[PDB]
Structure formats: C-alpha cells, structure tokens
Amino acid sequence: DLSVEAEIAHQIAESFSKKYAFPSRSSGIFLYNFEQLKMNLDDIVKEAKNVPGVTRLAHDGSKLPLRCVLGWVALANSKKFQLLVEANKLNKIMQDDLNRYA
C-alpha cells in the first residue's frame, strides 16, 4: 500500500529530529533521532513497515510508536547504534511500546 507509506513518511518526517531515549550498555540512556541514521526518508519508511502493527496503525491514521520504530530501524542499520544499545532492554521497550499502541 502507498497511502500507508505516506502516513509513515509524514509522521516520521514531522519527528525527524526529535530525540528519543534508548538503553545503554554503560548504563542509563543515550539519545537518538531518525536524522542520525544517515538514511534517506524513503529508506526509513520502507524499513519501518517491518515493525509489527505500524502498517495497520498508519492505515488507520493513528500515532505511530516512533521511539519503537527508530530503535527498530536503527538496530538493523546502524552498527554504532547496535554497539551503544543494550539489546535486551531495547527489545523489552519495543515490546511494551507496541502493546500500549495496540
């Protein structure tokens, strides 16, 4: 579908610079945004569709779980993000995010 791509692209573009908190390996949190992926918007949208539920949510026009989407796309595309992030805590976060946005 291409209308869901538009909504995903629009919600991601509006928040493209917004900083989100992800768990670190040292401790605490580090900040990340979509911009630091160094990826083109079209590529992020394409990758965001792997996140469970976001295509349905975008079809309905609901707010997307952007922190969960960013962490998902980053875990798959940024070797630096992978090395900064504690994956176990990221996993649980993205899981809890998707259950709240149900």
Structure tokens at 86: 């504690």
Q: What technique solved it?
A: X-ray
Which residues in 20-35 are b (16+ Cβ under 10 Å) and which e? bebbeeeeeeeebebe
Nearest to 1 by CA among 57, 39, 41: 57
51: Cβ–Cβ under 8 A, 6 or more apart, which residues? 65, 68, 69, 72, 94, 98
The answer to whether residues 95 and 88 touch, using CB atoms and an 8 Å cutoff, is: no
Query: Looking at the 3D structure of the chain, how many domains does it have?
Result: 1
Reported structure resolution in angstroms: 3.0
Q: Degrees (nearest 5) of the Cα angle 21, 102, 40?
A: 50
The answer to whether residues 48 and 85 touch, using CB atoms and an 8 Å cutoff, is: no
> Domain residues for 35?
1-102
The answer to whether residues 61 and 80 touch, using CB atoms and an 8 Å cutoff, is: no
E strands, the chain, where? 20-23, 29-32
